[PDB]
Amino acid sequence: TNQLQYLHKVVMKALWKHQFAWPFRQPVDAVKLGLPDYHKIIKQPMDMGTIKRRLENNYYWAASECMQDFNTMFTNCYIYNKPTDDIVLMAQTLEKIFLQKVASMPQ
Amino acid sequence: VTNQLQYLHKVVMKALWKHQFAWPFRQPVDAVKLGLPDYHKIIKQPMDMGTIKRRLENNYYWAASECMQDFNTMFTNCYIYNKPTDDIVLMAQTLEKIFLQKVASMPQ
Ligand SMILES: Cc1noc2c1-c1sc(C)c(C)c1C(c1ccc(Cl)cc1)=N[C@H]2CC(N)=O
Numbered sequence: 001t002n003q004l005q006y007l008h009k010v011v012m013k014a015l016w017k018h019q020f021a022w023p024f025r026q027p028v029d030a031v032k033l034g035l036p037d038y039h040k041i042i043k044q045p046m047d048m049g050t051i052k053r054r055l056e057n058n059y060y061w062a063a064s065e066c067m068q069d070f071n072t073m074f075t076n077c078y079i080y081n082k083p084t085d086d087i088v089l090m091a092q093t094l095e096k097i098f099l100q101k102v103a104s105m106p107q
Numbered sequence: 108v109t110n111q112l113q114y115l116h117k118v119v120m121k122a123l124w125k126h127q128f129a130w131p132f133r134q135p136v137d138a139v140k141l142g143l144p145d146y147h148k149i150i151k152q153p154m155d156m157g158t159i160k161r162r163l164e165n166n167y168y169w170a171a172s173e174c175m176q177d178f179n180t181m182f183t184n185c186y187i188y189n190k191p192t193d194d195i196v197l198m199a200q201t202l203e204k205i206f207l208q209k210v211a212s213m214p215q
């Protein structure tokens with residue numbers, strides 16, 4: 001759709017290159033980061049690399065499905081981390097860009 | 108008054124305000140009532156649907172993006188403050204899904 005193409009070429013494009021994007025470009029690697037409780041707490045892992053591949057492979061049926069994956073990714077960050085963690089501020093920053101850009105998504 | 112703000116008021120707020128899980132979000136978190144002396148230490152920008160609704164009713168917003176940011180802050184506040192296993196987290200996620208579904212169909 002027009003909408004998915006916008007989420008791909010405008011919204012993801014903008015988030016991907018952001019200085020705070022790097023933790024979100026691939027799945028959380030619980031072994032490398034030493035987080036034995038990550039997959040016990042976060043039951044639906046999501047990252048922008050996954051979303052991006054989904055956009056490329058025509059996985060999504062509707063814009064809202066993709067927006068829901070974006071939302072899951074940010075929500076997982078807030079749920080798992082301490083409120084004072086830098087990553088929380090990084091996610092909030094990225095989430096505000098997402099919504100600002102979503103407001104202009106062609107209908 | 109914008110077409111988007113009227114959409115957020117008539118479609119988004121309408122749907123969310125009457126939802127069966129909306130009741131925790133209809134007024135600001137009352138830290139005294141709930142026995143939460145750290146609430147305002149952790150959440151620096153409290154937000155609730157009662158405030159957004161009043162803002163929509165009083166033409167406080169200049170752009171729909173601003174109203175959408177308030178909704179977002181309200182949900183984010185919930186995920187940050189609460190433990191992962193808390194029922195309110197699931198209530199918030201339910202409401203936020205409806206939010207995102209509706210904003211996908213907002214004009215322009
Ligand atoms: C996304 C996401 N959600 O949680 C986490 C992540 C990711 S992915 C990734 C490549 C890293 C370095 C993390 C960080 C993290 C830690 C410090 C800073 Cl500045 C930024 C991110 N934190 C973990 C949690 C933990 N305490 O290790």
Ligand SMILES: Cc1noc2c1-c1sc(C)c(C)c1C(c1ccc(Cl)cc1)=N[C@H]2CC(N)=O
Pocket residue numbers: 130131132136137141143184185188189194195
């Ligand atoms: C919104 C928001 N963010 O956090 C909180 C809230 C609110 S507002 C409100 C009127 C209540 C009853 C809460 C609940 C809460 C607790 C149990 C259930 Cl079923 C539903 C909400 N939890 C507090 C946090 C806490 N531990 O009390």
